Each structure stands twice: as structure tokens, then as C-alpha cells.
Design a protein around this ligand. Structure first.
Ligand SMILES: COC(=O)c1c(C)n[nH]c1-c1ccco1
Ligand SMILES: COC(=O)c1c(C)n[nH]c1-c1ccco1
Ligand SMILES: CN(C)c1ncnc2nc[nH]c12
Ligand SMILES: CN(C)c1ncnc2nc[nH]c12
Lengths: 208, 208
């Protein structure tokens, strides 16, 4: 069963801005997603010090970058803390409303699209390069979900019946037809080397 | 009763490096502490969406910068999530060991002291400008503590019997005698305007 939800008007606005504004420096989407994964991994690691059983769903704390040309997807996989249904539908959600607003205001004031991360909404930078984003995620306290949006003002969530992931998050970027350079090994290596050099987790770039 | 603890050898190393290395761009300590406060405020705000009673210890989410020339202190106050005794003594602690190591390695490799934040140990940047740091903190689940260190390989923790703070963290920087410019309104304003422009919380600079 697939549930369909309306983004709040402000997030829809933001998504449309990212999609519509002419902005050539798109590569920053990857720094933002890697950094999102890094924060999710910090959080699970932190929680684990006071409750070791939080790691029963897997001990390795890592980030995998997985390009697939047949499918035209770039997937960022982490084993961080994962997201609950309430995060997907409500909490993220509420936090994104105020980051959006602040980010909008700063843009009017000459700030730049690359600064999206300072406003806690870097995940939406994925729409610089993706026509569709699917997010698979498993939190310890909850079941595995698939969230999905091509923007246009709505998203879906359903319980996921794919390969079970243990704990973590997979962001599957369905790339715009003119953004396939982000499937290329030397392009991804360049981008990681330039913006994500000091991430405190191993980042494995899978080959095709 | 005052408990005295030994820093792990690696944190002592890091503290000594920050204290000893010739490095003129000291102002970055303030961006790091403001950013620490911002993350503590994000965390309490996040937790509050699933448990509103977490805010019974105060609803305002803010950052105050308080200079005092008589005392020669600059205090960064937040109402974020606060720290428990276990954070002070163990958890921070364990997380700082690996950030330290990575930060050490990057420095050998030509990275710069200003990059300390990428390695989760920006709090120690306070020793660029402070001969002594006192940290007062209250977490919902625990009592109010005073932590204190002048480096030299040890720190103390005691239960604090000062003004009760509700919930949050006060970082009191006892400034080195040659670092009093950080007590000055126009200097602090300059620094906040330059490095902390987009923080998503009101930052009030108190006057003397
Ligand atoms: C990995 O997914 C996300 O970050 C996400 C989803 C699925 N909804 N809203 C968000 C979000 C909005 C702002 C920060 O995160
Ligand atoms: C506000 O205080 C701190 O950040 C703190 C204290 C009191 N111990 N270790 C830390 C710390 C080490 C690394 C990140 O945080
Ligand atoms: C909210 N948000 C950005 C996220 N939450 C949990 N795990 C994630 N992995 C990548 N992004 C994540
Ligand atoms: C670990 N750490 C950096 C901190 N934890 C909780 N509250 C804080 N306020 C400033 N820094 C904080």
C-alpha cells in the first residue's frame, strides 16, 4: 500500500527553486549528501556509547557511492542512524520549514545555492541533478521504508520489501538525462577529493 | 567534592599542540563554539518533536555572547541539549580520540588549524585564546555540572551550585592576557558577521 503526502507549500517552493534556477555549480549536491550521511553516522556512533545494542543491526560505520549506468542512478549508501516513518512524514518536515525560510531570505540577500547546508536542507540539493529521488531507510526502532519524490508537490512513503539493509539510508538519485557525468568514476573521485576529503568514515566508490 | 581526571594522552597532545603552535588566525575559536552551540540547539529541537516535555526546562533556543572585562572572560551561553556527567567524563571523550588522530594526520599533511571543526574537536580551539576553560552545563536527564581545565593533562568535574541554568551550556573562556581584543564589542561583531552569519538561532551580543 502506497501513501501519498503533500509537501508543505514552503518545501515545494524550495524544491521548485532548486529545479528552476539557472545554477551551473551542481556538483555540490554530492558534498551535501555525503555530509548528511556523516551526520547520520556520528549520531548512531554517539548513541552506541550509552547503549551498545544499538549496533546489533550492524557494526560497520561507512559510506558507499554506487553508480549504475544501466539504471542511470547514483546511490549514496550509509549505515548511519536511519529514519523513522515519523521523520519521513512529520519531523523532517517541521525542521525543513524554518531552514527553507532562512535559506530563501539569504538567497534574496545575494547568498548562493551552494550554501544550502548551512540551513539544514542540503538533502534537497539532490534535485539539482536528479529528476527523481528514492530514499530507502531503516531505523532501529521502526521498519524499512521507501520514500520517493519527483517533486511536483508530492511524495510517497511505503513499507519497503526490497533487500533488507540492517540499519541506515540509501539515497537513490535518478539522474536527469543531461547529468550522467555523475555516473563517471573520474568525475565522482574529483568531486569527493575536492569537497569531502576529511569525512571521518571510509567512503568506497564502487566501480561498474 | 571535586573529581580530577586525566585526559587521554591523545587529547593532551592535541591540547598542547593548539597551545604551542604558532598560529595567528585565532579568531576561528568563536565560529567553532557558536557552531557547537548550534548543533546542541538542533539536537534539543529535534528531540522535542517526539517528546514535547523535553522543553519543560525552557522553550527559548538561543545563543548569548557575554564579555566581562573585570573578570576577563568571554562566555558562550546556549540553551541546547546540555551535557551529562557521562558525556563529560567518558563519551566526549571516546569520540574526541578518533577526531584528534585524524586531525593530527591532516596537519602533518598540510591541513590547517582552522579546519579543526571537520574532525569534531572544535571545542578544543578555545585554548587558542583561553588559559582556562570552565564549562557549566545542564542536561534534562542529569544534574548541573562544572567542568574545568587549564590543560596540563587534567580536568575536573564537580556538581555545580551556581545559578541554576534550566538546560544548556555555558563555555567560560578565561582569556590569555594578550587576547583581550575578544572582549571588545566591535571585534566580536566583526567575527560573528564574518564566520557565523547564517546560524539558525538568535545570537545576542551582551554589552558591558
Ligand atoms: C535522506 O532524506 C532526507 O534527508 C529527507 C527526506 C526523505 N525527507 N525530508 C528530508 C530532509 C529535509 C531536510 C533535511 O532532510
Ligand atoms: C562544551 O564542552 C565540550 O565540547 C567538551 C568537554 C567539556 N569535554 N570534551 C568536550 C569535547 C571534545 C570534543 C568535542 O567536545
Ligand atoms: C535527515 N537526514 C539528512 C538523514 N537522516 C538519517 N540518515 C541519513 N543519511 C543521509 N541523510 C540522512
Ligand atoms: C559536545 N559539545 C560540543 C556540546 N554539547 C552540548 N552542548 C554544547 N553547547 C556547546 N557545545 C556543546
Amino acid at each position: 500500500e502506497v501513501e501519498t503526502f503533500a509537501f508543505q507549500a514552503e518545501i515545494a517552493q524550495l524544491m521548485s527553486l532548486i529545479i528552476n534556477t539557472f545554477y551551473s555549480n551542481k556538483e555540490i549536491f554530492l558534498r551535501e549528501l555525503i555530509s548528511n550521511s556523516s551526520d547520520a553516522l556520528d549520531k548512531i556512533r554517539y548513541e552506541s556509547l550509552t547503549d551498545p545494542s544499538k549496533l546489533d543491526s550492524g557494526k560497520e560505520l561507512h559510506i558507499n557511492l554506487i553508480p549504475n549506468k544501466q539504471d542511470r542512478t547514483l546511490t549514496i549508501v550509509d549505515t548511519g542512524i536511519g529514519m523513522t516513518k515519523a521523520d519521513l512524514i512529520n519531523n523532517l518536515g517541521t525542521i525543513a520549514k524554518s531552514g527553507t525560510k532562512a535559506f530563501m531570505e539569504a538567497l534574496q540577500a545575494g547568498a548562493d545555492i551552494s550554501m544550502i547546508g548551512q540551513f539544514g536542507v542540503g538533502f534537497y540539493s539532490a534535485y539539482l541533478v536528479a529528476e527523481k529521488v528514492t530514499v530507502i531507510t531503516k531505523h532501529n526502532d521502526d521498519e524499512q521504508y521507501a520514500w520517493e519524490s519527483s517533486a511536483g508537490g508530492s511524495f510517497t512513503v511505503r513499507t519497503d520489501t526490497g533487500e533488507p539493509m540492517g540499519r541506515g539510508t540509501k539515497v537513490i538519485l535518478h539522474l536527469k538525462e543531461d547529468q550522467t557525468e555523475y555516473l563517471e568514476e573520474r568525475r565522482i573521485k574529483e568531486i569527493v577529493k575536492k569537497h569531502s576529503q576529511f569525512i571521518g568514515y571510509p567512503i568506497t566508490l564502487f566501480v561498474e
